[PDB]
Design a protein around this nucleic acid. Sequence first.
RNA 1: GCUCGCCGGAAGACCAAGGGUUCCUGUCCAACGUUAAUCGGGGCAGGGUGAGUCGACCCCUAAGGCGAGGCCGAAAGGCGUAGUCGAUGGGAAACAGGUUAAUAUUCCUGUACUUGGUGUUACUGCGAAGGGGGGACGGAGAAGGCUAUGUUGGCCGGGCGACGGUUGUCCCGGUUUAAGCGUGUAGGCUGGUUUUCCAGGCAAAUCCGGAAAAUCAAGGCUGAGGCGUGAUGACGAGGCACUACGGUGCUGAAGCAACAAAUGCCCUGCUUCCAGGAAAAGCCUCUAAGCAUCAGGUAACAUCAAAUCGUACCCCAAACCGACACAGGUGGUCAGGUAGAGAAUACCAAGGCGCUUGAGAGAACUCGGGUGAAGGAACUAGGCAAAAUGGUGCCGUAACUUCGGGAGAAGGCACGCUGAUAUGUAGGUGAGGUCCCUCGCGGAUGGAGCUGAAAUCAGUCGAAGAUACCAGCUGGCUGCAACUGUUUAUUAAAAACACAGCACUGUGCAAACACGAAAGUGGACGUAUACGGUGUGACGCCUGCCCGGUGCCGGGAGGUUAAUU
RNA 2: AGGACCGAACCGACUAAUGUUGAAAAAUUAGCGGAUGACUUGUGGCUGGGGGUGAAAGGCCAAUCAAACCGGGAGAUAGCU
Lengths: 93, 271, 46
Amino acid sequence: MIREERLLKVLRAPHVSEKASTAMEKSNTIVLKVAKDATKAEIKAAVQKLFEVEVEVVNTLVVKGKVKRHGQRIGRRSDWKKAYVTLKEGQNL
Amino acid sequence: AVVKCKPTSPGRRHVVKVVNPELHKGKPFAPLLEKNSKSGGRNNNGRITTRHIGGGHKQAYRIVDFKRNKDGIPAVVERLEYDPNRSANIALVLYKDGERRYILAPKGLKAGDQIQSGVDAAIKPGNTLPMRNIPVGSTVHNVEMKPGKGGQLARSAGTYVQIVARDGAYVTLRLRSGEMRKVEADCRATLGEVGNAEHMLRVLGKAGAARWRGVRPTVRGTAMNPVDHPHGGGEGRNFGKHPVTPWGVQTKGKKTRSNKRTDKFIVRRRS
Amino acid sequence: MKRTFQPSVLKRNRSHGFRARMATKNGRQVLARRRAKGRARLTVSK
RNA sequence: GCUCGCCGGAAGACCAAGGGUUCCUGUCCAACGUUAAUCGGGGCAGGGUGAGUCGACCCCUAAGGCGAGGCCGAAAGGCGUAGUCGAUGGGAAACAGGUUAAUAUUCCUGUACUUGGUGUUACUGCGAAGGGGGGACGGAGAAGGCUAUGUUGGCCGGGCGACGGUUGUCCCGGUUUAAGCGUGUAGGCUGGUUUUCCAGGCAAAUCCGGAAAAUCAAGGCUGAGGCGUGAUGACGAGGCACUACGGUGCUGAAGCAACAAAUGCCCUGCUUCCAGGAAAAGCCUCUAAGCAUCAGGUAACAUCAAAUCGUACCCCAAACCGACACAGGUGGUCAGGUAGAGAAUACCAAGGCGCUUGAGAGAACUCGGGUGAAGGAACUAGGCAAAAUGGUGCCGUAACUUCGGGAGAAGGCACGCUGAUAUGUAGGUGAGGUCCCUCGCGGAUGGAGCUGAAAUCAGUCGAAGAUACCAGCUGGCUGCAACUGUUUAUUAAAAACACAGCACUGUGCAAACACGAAAGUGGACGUAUACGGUGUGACGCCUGCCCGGUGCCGGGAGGUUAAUU
RNA sequence: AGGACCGAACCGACUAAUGUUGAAAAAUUAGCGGAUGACUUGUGGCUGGGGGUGAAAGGCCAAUCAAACCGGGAGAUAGCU
């Protein structure tokens, strides 16, 4: 499922928002931006090795980037992948 | 039996239908079924090549044994069936070795009757054998034109052929068209007439009845415009043409047979 | 009333898509003329 | 915020297609919004779409597409075999509750299920691209059993009324609970088991098919719903606490029965008819090549896995197709109360709205309506338009007729409410009890309770009882076309086209004919009771004379006559 | 049983008024015909321009079809304005 070079490139950033904070307080679930091509398996092992915590389940979605017009021309933001990584009951960080 | 319908509605008054209680009710023998793809009269270019074909009921194809070359093994007729693909009826026959086939149902044949094919089968209705061993004068149907190729002559409901002569390797047949034709005597034929002679006594009674059979309307040429048909348009009802096909060829009277390679088998043309 | 454009992405792509142009010599010429004109959109794609 | 009004088989809710952030929150108002705009589907920023079992992908094919070689064609290319693609169809599995400003059968809580891998253990013949089964199939109709759902009663909580009465035969509200698991019911289909033999199933078969004995009468298969369990729970009016007054927390009564009842389910059924009603895989079974103490098969427990993409929002529309925030167009699903035959119609519930210029005024004239003295088609090309008729039951109904029709012909009578028959009837449903039982979701008996049209008699209110909405005008003579259909999308729906029926004529199958320089294909997996072309146009009585002209069919002697020599 | 009868949905389009710089480049309102059939409709497919398709009106083939649309021959030609 893993090879360390790949594992280091899969997790991109913490995602901060009220939904992401509540998901931590209420469900011990951390919300992340991950590599667009990442799989739930890679995310689960990357989190388990790097952040050194035990993972229960990983859920993922793909966010469509918003379009912004500019007179006669449009710009488009990038799609990215969101990961809801649920930690095991014994919460850490 | 042919039955008239009562005029409880105007499209019923003239219906006269062929109802045969000998025919199996319900479903056929599935292992002899194939798919049957309707065409709308269009060829592999997607063009209408034969007009007036379209719609009408879906149909499954019954695999019918026109060759009748399971020689030596007797068979019994299990039942007569309705076949949507043809005017004749068919018989489901069971061979002594467990095999089942369909055959054209000859007149008089019914469940229980025994059939058989081969050089030595008995001279009786529903039997098949090479015409060099059917007595001159007999009445046959499902006649082969080449040995072992499969029956092609006199299959439609009520038709039959008469062997009027045998000489050399060739028999002479009076086809149902009236034509006298030579066919080689090793060709197979089945004794009797094709069943369901009352087929020609049906009266569809209404337009929808022809639609159920996949026949679309015919539009008369003289009802068109000149650009569409040589029978032109006019101004009120006008004609004054010599009647032709939509493609300018003389209908009514012009011979269109042109086959020098088979001329030699035609003893006398139909009259 | 009912108008002439009734959309269907599946039918759009089959009649006019990139692969449909590529399938015939003349469709491949539609794409040549279009690349020589310098178009941004060769066909309507995803 | 309190009222009023509108839709309610939609103007509500949910899908697909299509769109693509329009979704939620904050903030802003120039432009966009047919007005103002603090508001917005507008600007700016941030947030938001969570799946083994919902869809896609995936396996399987349909029409059809593509197509190694190949056949054909000046080139380009056309067609096509093996194959390979292609859903609008077939194929494993998840439900109820809670939660967010915005997602949820995806998160959480509870309770499940499916198919694979790995291990353990007991038993065991395993094995396919092949065989067989199965999957797997129409229309119409009948009506029995049910559920969804509703109504009443009971039960529980609350109520005692702004103005005469209201502790009662009173008022209001609630009375909800899934998949899964167990049971195998109303009902549907079918005889079962053993042995032996065999020209079929491309070889093989223990399977299918066929044959022959033996033997038992009950065996198997399918199957809504109910009941139980799931549920020690969830949901639940309300209560008590807090509250930034938006909310949050804790707690929580009854949760039954009877009757009615679908167009949903049993039903891919049953009955019946002719027009005779996909394919392939998954699946079950059979063997072949093989493998034989291996492998593999079946089972229980355990363990692991089920990736990836979609998921926001609009969706009969202000977000899709219409240049517009356009009276247009857009496939499927859901179906509450009263009246009603009803999915018509009227009023309502849930839910959603008052349609993005308003304020006054109360002229002509225009638009859309209501009423009208006397007359009643005198109008006009024409009763154009209006007005009128309109329901159910019973009585009754002409010429003509192809005996079906004409016919709802025409015309007439009854119609509300209350009581009696009967404090609720005929009927429908059906409990306790008693008895039997191959004991059950059983049978008989029994008739309580519940529900309930219609009739007659008597009485009674109004001008009027099919009172509203809703809802045929009728008759006589005649042209034309038999009829139902079809047609000039957008000035013509007709007497025009079609039609069943009739005739002529071609066509012996490598058919005629048609699309194609061709290959190939349609005709047709049809075969003269068939297929094409042409005309006529149900049916009834019938269809006469003319072959000179033009056309077509047949003819061979003579004349004339091409390339060629 | 029925191209059977009455009648919503659904399909159609006989009459009239309105509208005609429309709410709408064909509609709206009141009426109207079919409504188990030659019915109606979703998804996808096939047929291509002297060609298709046509229950036939020269109808339809992407808002003007007795020969579509686009590009090219092209500055066709115009004894005409």
